[PDB]
mmCIF file with all atom_site columns, all heavy atoms in Angstrom:
data_model
loop_
_atom_site.group_PDB
_atom_site.id
_atom_site.type_symbol
_atom_site.label_atom_id
_atom_site.label_alt_id
_atom_site.label_comp_id
_atom_site.label_asym_id
_atom_site.label_entity_id
_atom_site.label_seq_id
_atom_site.pdbx_PDB_ins_code
_atom_site.Cartn_x
_atom_site.Cartn_y
_atom_site.Cartn_z
_atom_site.occupancy
_atom_site.B_iso_or_equiv
_atom_site.pdbx_formal_charge
_atom_site.auth_seq_id
_atom_site.auth_comp_id
_atom_site.auth_asym_id
_atom_site.auth_atom_id
_atom_site.pdbx_PDB_model_num
ATOM 1   N N   . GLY B 1 60 ? -31.405 -46.756 30.384 1.00 16.55 ? 60 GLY B N   1
ATOM 2   C CA  . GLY B 1 60 ? -31.154 -46.893 29.009 1.00 16.55 ? 60 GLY B CA  1
ATOM 3   C C   . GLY B 1 60 ? -31.688 -45.931 28.083 1.00 16.55 ? 60 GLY B C   1
ATOM 4   O O   . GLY B 1 60 ? -32.607 -45.173 28.323 1.00 16.55 ? 60 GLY B O   1
ATOM 5   N N   . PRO B 1 61 ? -31.165 -45.999 26.860 1.00 18.33 ? 61 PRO B N   1
ATOM 6   C CA  . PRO B 1 61 ? -30.041 -46.799 26.303 1.00 18.33 ? 61 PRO B CA  1
ATOM 7   C C   . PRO B 1 61 ? -28.673 -46.430 27.001 1.00 18.33 ? 61 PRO B C   1
ATOM 8   O O   . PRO B 1 61 ? -28.383 -45.190 27.124 1.00 18.33 ? 61 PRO B O   1
ATOM 9   C CB  . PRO B 1 61 ? -29.961 -46.383 24.831 1.00 18.33 ? 61 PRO B CB  1
ATOM 10  C CG  . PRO B 1 61 ? -31.355 -46.039 24.534 1.00 18.33 ? 61 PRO B CG  1
ATOM 11  C CD  . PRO B 1 61 ? -31.797 -45.245 25.740 1.00 18.33 ? 61 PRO B CD  1
ATOM 12  N N   . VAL B 1 62 ? -27.925 -47.421 27.355 1.00 18.07 ? 62 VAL B N   1
ATOM 13  C CA  . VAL B 1 62 ? -26.709 -47.243 28.116 1.00 18.07 ? 62 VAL B CA  1
ATOM 14  C C   . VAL B 1 62 ? -25.585 -47.460 27.092 1.00 18.07 ? 62 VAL B C   1
ATOM 15  O O   . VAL B 1 62 ? -25.572 -48.416 26.297 1.00 18.07 ? 62 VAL B O   1
ATOM 16  C CB  . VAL B 1 62 ? -26.551 -48.315 29.225 1.00 18.07 ? 62 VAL B CB  1
ATOM 17  C CG1 . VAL B 1 62 ? -25.218 -48.298 29.836 1.00 18.07 ? 62 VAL B CG1 1
ATOM 18  C CG2 . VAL B 1 62 ? -27.704 -48.084 30.241 1.00 18.07 ? 62 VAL B CG2 1
ATOM 19  N N   . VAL B 1 63 ? -24.643 -46.493 27.120 1.00 21.19 ? 63 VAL B N   1
ATOM 20  C CA  . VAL B 1 63 ? -23.461 -46.588 26.305 1.00 21.19 ? 63 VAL B CA  1
ATOM 21  C C   . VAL B 1 63 ? -22.213 -46.283 27.223 1.00 21.19 ? 63 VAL B C   1
ATOM 22  O O   . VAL B 1 63 ? -22.302 -45.336 27.976 1.00 21.19 ? 63 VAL B O   1
ATOM 23  C CB  . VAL B 1 63 ? -23.570 -45.442 25.168 1.00 21.19 ? 63 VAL B CB  1
ATOM 24  C CG1 . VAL B 1 63 ? -22.251 -45.365 24.310 1.00 21.19 ? 63 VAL B CG1 1
ATOM 25  C CG2 . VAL B 1 63 ? -24.877 -45.758 24.393 1.00 21.19 ? 63 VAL B CG2 1
ATOM 26  N N   . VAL B 1 64 ? -21.253 -47.113 27.086 1.00 21.88 ? 64 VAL B N   1
ATOM 27  C CA  . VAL B 1 64 ? -20.080 -46.963 27.917 1.00 21.88 ? 64 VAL B CA  1
ATOM 28  C C   . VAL B 1 64 ? -18.763 -46.855 26.979 1.00 21.88 ? 64 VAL B C   1
ATOM 29  O O   . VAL B 1 64 ? -18.738 -47.611 26.054 1.00 21.88 ? 64 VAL B O   1
ATOM 30  C CB  . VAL B 1 64 ? -19.927 -48.151 28.820 1.00 21.88 ? 64 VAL B CB  1
ATOM 31  C CG1 . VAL B 1 64 ? -18.696 -47.864 29.824 1.00 21.88 ? 64 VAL B CG1 1
ATOM 32  C CG2 . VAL B 1 64 ? -21.188 -48.462 29.497 1.00 21.88 ? 64 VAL B CG2 1
ATOM 33  N N   . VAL B 1 65 ? -18.039 -45.888 27.281 1.00 19.38 ? 65 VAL B N   1
ATOM 34  C CA  . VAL B 1 65 ? -16.826 -45.589 26.435 1.00 19.38 ? 65 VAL B CA  1
ATOM 35  C C   . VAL B 1 65 ? -15.587 -45.818 27.426 1.00 19.38 ? 65 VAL B C   1
ATOM 36  O O   . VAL B 1 65 ? -15.309 -45.238 28.457 1.00 19.38 ? 65 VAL B O   1
ATOM 37  C CB  . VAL B 1 65 ? -16.760 -44.057 25.994 1.00 19.38 ? 65 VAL B CB  1
ATOM 38  C CG1 . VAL B 1 65 ? -15.556 -43.844 25.225 1.00 19.38 ? 65 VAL B CG1 1
ATOM 39  C CG2 . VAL B 1 65 ? -17.983 -43.741 25.310 1.00 19.38 ? 65 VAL B CG2 1
ATOM 40  N N   . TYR B 1 66 ? -14.738 -46.796 26.893 1.00 20.61 ? 66 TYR B N   1
ATOM 41  C CA  . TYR B 1 66 ? -13.514 -47.119 27.447 1.00 20.61 ? 66 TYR B CA  1
ATOM 42  C C   . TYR B 1 66 ? -12.367 -46.712 26.580 1.00 20.61 ? 66 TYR B C   1
ATOM 43  O O   . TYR B 1 66 ? -12.523 -46.506 25.374 1.00 20.61 ? 66 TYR B O   1
ATOM 44  C CB  . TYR B 1 66 ? -13.436 -48.615 27.761 1.00 20.61 ? 66 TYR B CB  1
ATOM 45  C CG  . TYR B 1 66 ? -14.257 -48.972 29.011 1.00 20.61 ? 66 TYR B CG  1
ATOM 46  C CD1 . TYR B 1 66 ? -15.336 -49.814 28.906 1.00 20.61 ? 66 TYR B CD1 1
ATOM 47  C CD2 . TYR B 1 66 ? -13.926 -48.441 30.236 1.00 20.61 ? 66 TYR B CD2 1
ATOM 48  C CE1 . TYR B 1 66 ? -16.132 -50.145 30.090 1.00 20.61 ? 66 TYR B CE1 1
ATOM 49  C CE2 . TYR B 1 66 ? -14.651 -48.719 31.451 1.00 20.61 ? 66 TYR B CE2 1
ATOM 50  C CZ  . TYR B 1 66 ? -15.818 -49.612 31.356 1.00 20.61 ? 66 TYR B CZ  1
ATOM 51  O OH  . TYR B 1 66 ? -16.269 -49.643 32.635 1.00 20.61 ? 66 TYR B OH  1
ATOM 52  N N   . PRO B 1 67 ? -11.096 -46.500 27.174 1.00 21.23 ? 67 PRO B N   1
ATOM 53  C CA  . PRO B 1 67 ? -10.750 -46.707 28.542 1.00 21.23 ? 67 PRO B CA  1
ATOM 54  C C   . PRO B 1 67 ? -11.208 -45.662 29.482 1.00 21.23 ? 67 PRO B C   1
ATOM 55  O O   . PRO B 1 67 ? -11.014 -45.759 30.680 1.00 21.23 ? 67 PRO B O   1
ATOM 56  C CB  . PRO B 1 67 ? -9.202  -46.832 28.598 1.00 21.23 ? 67 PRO B CB  1
ATOM 57  C CG  . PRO B 1 67 ? -8.804  -46.159 27.304 1.00 21.23 ? 67 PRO B CG  1
ATOM 58  C CD  . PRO B 1 67 ? -9.914  -46.197 26.344 1.00 21.23 ? 67 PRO B CD  1
ATOM 59  N N   . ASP B 1 68 ? -11.810 -44.569 29.073 1.00 22.19 ? 68 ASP B N   1
ATOM 60  C CA  . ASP B 1 68 ? -12.158 -43.448 29.815 1.00 22.19 ? 68 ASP B CA  1
ATOM 61  C C   . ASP B 1 68 ? -13.065 -43.802 30.921 1.00 22.19 ? 68 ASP B C   1
ATOM 62  O O   . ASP B 1 68 ? -13.069 -43.267 32.093 1.00 22.19 ? 68 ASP B O   1
ATOM 63  C CB  . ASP B 1 68 ? -13.064 -42.458 28.985 1.00 22.19 ? 68 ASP B CB  1
ATOM 64  C CG  . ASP B 1 68 ? -12.479 -42.043 27.585 1.00 22.19 ? 68 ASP B CG  1
ATOM 65  O OD1 . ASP B 1 68 ? -11.784 -42.906 26.908 1.00 22.19 ? 68 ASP B OD1 1
ATOM 66  O OD2 . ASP B 1 68 ? -12.854 -41.011 27.150 1.00 22.19 ? 68 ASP B OD2 1
ATOM 67  N N   . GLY B 1 69 ? -13.960 -44.827 30.766 1.00 24.52 ? 69 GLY B N   1
ATOM 68  C CA  . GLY B 1 69 ? -14.907 -45.189 31.852 1.00 24.52 ? 69 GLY B CA  1
ATOM 69  C C   . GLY B 1 69 ? -16.016 -44.271 31.985 1.00 24.52 ? 69 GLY B C   1
ATOM 70  O O   . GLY B 1 69 ? -16.578 -44.081 33.015 1.00 24.52 ? 69 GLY B O   1
ATOM 71  N N   . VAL B 1 70 ? -16.495 -43.723 30.923 1.00 22.44 ? 70 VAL B N   1
ATOM 72  C CA  . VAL B 1 70 ? -17.662 -42.946 30.871 1.00 22.44 ? 70 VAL B CA  1
ATOM 73  C C   . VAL B 1 70 ? -18.927 -43.656 30.453 1.00 22.44 ? 70 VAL B C   1
ATOM 74  O O   . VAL B 1 70 ? -18.998 -44.239 29.489 1.00 22.44 ? 70 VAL B O   1
ATOM 75  C CB  . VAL B 1 70 ? -17.460 -41.696 29.918 1.00 22.44 ? 70 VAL B CB  1
ATOM 76  C CG1 . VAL B 1 70 ? -18.683 -40.908 29.788 1.00 22.44 ? 70 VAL B CG1 1
ATOM 77  C CG2 . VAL B 1 70 ? -16.277 -40.777 30.384 1.00 22.44 ? 70 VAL B CG2 1
ATOM 78  N N   . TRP B 1 71 ? -19.894 -43.539 31.410 1.00 24.62 ? 71 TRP B N   1
ATOM 79  C CA  . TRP B 1 71 ? -21.119 -44.179 31.276 1.00 24.62 ? 71 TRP B CA  1
ATOM 80  C C   . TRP B 1 71 ? -22.166 -43.122 30.869 1.00 24.62 ? 71 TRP B C   1
ATOM 81  O O   . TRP B 1 71 ? -22.305 -42.168 31.623 1.00 24.62 ? 71 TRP B O   1
ATOM 82  C CB  . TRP B 1 71 ? -21.728 -44.893 32.516 1.00 24.62 ? 71 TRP B CB  1
ATOM 83  C CG  . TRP B 1 71 ? -20.818 -46.134 32.885 1.00 24.62 ? 71 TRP B CG  1
ATOM 84  C CD1 . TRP B 1 71 ? -19.456 -46.181 33.194 1.00 24.62 ? 71 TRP B CD1 1
ATOM 85  C CD2 . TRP B 1 71 ? -21.226 -47.514 33.022 1.00 24.62 ? 71 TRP B CD2 1
ATOM 86  N NE1 . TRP B 1 71 ? -19.112 -47.417 33.519 1.00 24.62 ? 71 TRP B NE1 1
ATOM 87  C CE2 . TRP B 1 71 ? -20.040 -48.319 33.423 1.00 24.62 ? 71 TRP B CE2 1
ATOM 88  C CE3 . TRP B 1 71 ? -22.386 -48.116 32.773 1.00 24.62 ? 71 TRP B CE3 1
ATOM 89  C CZ2 . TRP B 1 71 ? -20.252 -49.657 33.611 1.00 24.62 ? 71 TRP B CZ2 1
ATOM 90  C CZ3 . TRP B 1 71 ? -22.521 -49.492 32.999 1.00 24.62 ? 71 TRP B CZ3 1
ATOM 91  C CH2 . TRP B 1 71 ? -21.388 -50.252 33.418 1.00 24.62 ? 71 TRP B CH2 1
ATOM 92  N N   . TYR B 1 72 ? -22.957 -43.369 29.757 1.00 27.83 ? 72 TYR B N   1
ATOM 93  C CA  . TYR B 1 72 ? -23.944 -42.601 29.289 1.00 27.83 ? 72 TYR B CA  1
ATOM 94  C C   . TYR B 1 72 ? -25.356 -43.354 29.522 1.00 27.83 ? 72 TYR B C   1
ATOM 95  O O   . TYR B 1 72 ? -25.317 -44.492 29.375 1.00 27.83 ? 72 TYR B O   1
ATOM 96  C CB  . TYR B 1 72 ? -23.866 -42.192 27.841 1.00 27.83 ? 72 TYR B CB  1
ATOM 97  C CG  . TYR B 1 72 ? -22.710 -41.324 27.433 1.00 27.83 ? 72 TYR B CG  1
ATOM 98  C CD1 . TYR B 1 72 ? -21.702 -41.836 26.701 1.00 27.83 ? 72 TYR B CD1 1
ATOM 99  C CD2 . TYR B 1 72 ? -22.766 -40.045 27.809 1.00 27.83 ? 72 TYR B CD2 1
ATOM 100 C CE1 . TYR B 1 72 ? -20.738 -40.920 26.369 1.00 27.83 ? 72 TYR B CE1 1
ATOM 101 C CE2 . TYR B 1 72 ? -21.730 -39.177 27.495 1.00 27.83 ? 72 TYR B CE2 1
ATOM 102 C CZ  . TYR B 1 72 ? -20.724 -39.587 26.644 1.00 27.83 ? 72 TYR B CZ  1
ATOM 103 O OH  . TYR B 1 72 ? -19.716 -38.864 26.237 1.00 27.83 ? 72 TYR B OH  1
ATOM 104 N N   . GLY B 1 73 ? -26.395 -42.521 29.874 1.00 27.02 ? 73 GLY B N   1
ATOM 105 C CA  . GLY B 1 73 ? -27.702 -43.049 29.755 1.00 27.02 ? 73 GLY B CA  1
ATOM 106 C C   . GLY B 1 73 ? -28.626 -42.229 29.077 1.00 27.02 ? 73 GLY B C   1
ATOM 107 O O   . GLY B 1 73 ? -28.341 -41.098 28.746 1.00 27.02 ? 73 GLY B O   1
#
Side-chain angles (χ1 to χ4, degrees):
Chain B
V62 177
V63 175
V64 185
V65 181
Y66 284 119
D68 315 27
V70 174
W71 297 59
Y72 292 113

